[PDB]
Amino acid sequence: KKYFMSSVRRMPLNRAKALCSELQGTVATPRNAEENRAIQNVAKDVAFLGITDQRTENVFEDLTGNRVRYTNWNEGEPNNVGSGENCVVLLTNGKWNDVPCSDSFLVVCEFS
């Protein structure tokens, strides 16, 4: 099964990726509502998910460039505000929001 663990500190996506990979895991990518809720269980505050539309705007892929199916966008999202929000975070209500990849949030790593 997948196991989810949340970080203590906040960091931008690249550092989040490096953290999870240090222990041979990846940034949590929920594939369904059950997994989304499991990530919610460990995330005490807004946290990065392993999803981005960095390749093509409004086409969301996991960090391995594999287009995702399941999404749980908060109402009004994704809105790509300003210069661009190409990363994704899980809000404390379980819904998602696109944010700048350079902004800092907790990270939830995924292992199996």
Binding site for a second copy (CB under 8 A): 3, 5-9, 19, 21-25, 109, 111
101 binds, options Cl ion, a second copy, Ca ion, none, Cβ within 5 to 8 A by partner type: Cl ion
The answer to whether 49 and 84 are in contact (CB under 8 A) is: no
Is residue 110 near Ca ion by the rule CB under 5 A? Answer: no
Report in angstroms how near the CB of residue 81 gets to Cl ion at its nearest: 10
54 binds, options a second copy, Cl ion, Ca ion, none, Cβ within 5 to 8 A by partner type: none
Between the alpha carbon of residue 27 and those of residues 16, 65, 79, the distances in Å are: 7, 13, 22
Closer of 3 and 70 to a second copy (Cβ)? 3
For residues 90 and 41, give the distance between their C-alpha atoms in angstroms, rounded to a whole number.
Answer: 11
The answer to whether 19 and 76 are in contact (CB under 8 A) is: no
Report in angstroms how near the CB of residue 105 gets to Cl ion at its nearest: 12
For residues 17 and 84, give the distance between their C-alpha atoms in angstroms, rounded to a whole number.
Answer: 20
100 binds, options a second copy, Ca ion, Cl ion, none, Cβ within 5 to 8 A by partner type: Cl ion
